[PDB]
Amino acid sequence: HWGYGKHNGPEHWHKDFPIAKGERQSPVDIDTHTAKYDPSLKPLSVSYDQATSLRILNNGHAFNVEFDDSQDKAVLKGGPLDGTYRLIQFHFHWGSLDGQGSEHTVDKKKYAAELHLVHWNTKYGDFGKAVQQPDGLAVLGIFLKVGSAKPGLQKVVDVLDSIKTKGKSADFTNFDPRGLLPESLDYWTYPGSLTTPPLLECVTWIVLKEPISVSSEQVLKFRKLNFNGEGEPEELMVDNWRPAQPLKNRQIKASFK
């Protein structure tokens, strides 16, 4: 099936998933001098106080930390968003080298990794229904640069040894996603898509301007994960990012000047 290698990577996805060449694909390059400040945007509201993490899973494409989304325990509201969006999981995309790994770019700059906190619009009842709607998901994206260690990320790093290969999961309760946010919630926003198959065009992207810093030791541990399953030849999980796609008929709005 699909992946990030030469023979199954992003250049190939359009054959099984023709929407890959669609009207509102993600990621994109964020040209900071083309985005328009929108003073009508309301303040972004990240409400993660009652967040309940459950488990961490390597699915052969990335790893995610899952959350109990059976109630409004951890939600994103405000900004360009109408209504309430519930946190279902977060995951990362990263590179083989510190100079690449993010999906979105900023004035063509690539970051070492990108964190995606995925939320679904509660008006649609469940995640599966939400992805079939043009306003079904809100994904909060945070760039990672290599610098000083991020204490709030270490508990995630600590557990990667236990989910090295495809299909492995481990208990991951009592994790606080608030520890992964930068100080500022300044952001750019645009309508886009999931960045992996099925590439559905159901996402309002909210990408924060301020990156978080993580240590080289922390990112190195991301790079020891495996795309392959247990007992198979080792393929390091690296460069699991889709490159920037054409902006086409879309406008990126900024929450700040």
Ligand X SMILES: CCC(=O)O[C@@H]1[C@@H](OC(=O)CC)[C@@H](O)O[C@H](COS(N)(=O)=O)[C@H]1OC(=O)CC
Residues that bind ligand X (CB under 6 A): 57, 59, 61-64, 89, 91, 116, 118, 139, 194-196
- The nearest distance, CB 20 to ligand X, in angstroms, is 13
Instruction: Return the number of the residue (21 or 216) whose C-beta is nearest ligand X.
Output: 21
Q: Which of ligand X, Zn ion, none sits in contact with 140, Cβ below 5 to 8 A by type?
A: none
Task: Give me 144's structure tokens.
Answer: 């990672």
Q: Please give the C-alpha separations between residue 153 and each of 60, 64, 115, 209, 211, in angstroms, as whole numbers.
A: 21, 13, 11, 19, 14
Q: Does the annotation list 12 as a binding residue?
A: no
Q: Shortest Cβ distance from residue 40 to Zn ion (Å)?
A: 28
Is residue 33 annotated as involved in ligand binding?
Answer: no
Interface residue list for Zn ion (CB under 5 A): 116
Q: How many CB atoms lie within 10 A of CB 31?
A: 14
- Contact between 45 and 76 (Cβ < 8 Å): yes
Q: Which is nearer to Zn ion, 41 or 198 (CB)?
A: 198
For the bound state, the minimum distance from the C-beta of residue 239 to ligand X, rounded and expressed in Å, comes to 13
Q: Tokens standing for 202?
A: 């159901």
CA-wise closest residue to 198 among 65, 20, 6: 20
Q: Which is nearer to Zn ion, 143 or 217 (CB)?
A: 143
Q: Which is nearer to Zn ion, 13 or 249 (CB)?
A: 13
Judge whether 1 counts as a catalytic residue: no
Q: Of 128 and 256, which has the nearer Cβ to ligand X?
A: 128
The first and second tokens of residue 20, run together, are: 């890959």
Ramachandran category for residue 162: left, alpha or beta (phi over 0 → left; psi -120 to 50 → alpha): alpha
The binder of 194, among ligand X, Zn ion, none, by C-beta within 5 to 8 A per type, is: ligand X
User: Binds 62, which of ligand X, Zn ion, none (CB < 5 to 8 A, cut-off by type)?
Assistant: ligand X
Q: For Zn ion, which residue has the nearest CB?
A: 116
Counts for the chain of helices (H) and strands (E), in that order: 3, 15
Interacting partner of 118 out of Zn ion, ligand X, none (Cβ under 5 to 8 A depending on kind): ligand X
**CA nearest neighbour of 59 among 231, 235, 228:** 228
Closest residue to ligand X, judged by C-beta, is 64
Peptide bond into 191 cis (omega under 30): no
Q: How far is the CB of 93 from Zn ion (least distance, A)?
A: 6
93 annotated as ligand-binding: yes
To Zn ion, the closest distance from the beta carbon of 196 in angstroms equals 7
170, with CB counted inside 10 A (0-12, 13-18, 19+), is middle
Which residue is catalytic, options 1, 12, 33, 61? 61
Nearest to 138 by CA among 217, 205, 215: 205
Q: Are strands 36-37 and 253-254 parallel, antiparallel or unpaired?
A: parallel
Q: Just list the catalytic residues.
A: 61
Binding-site residues: 91, 93, 116, 195-196
Binding-site residues for substrate: 195-196
Binding-site residues for Zn(2+): 91, 93, 116
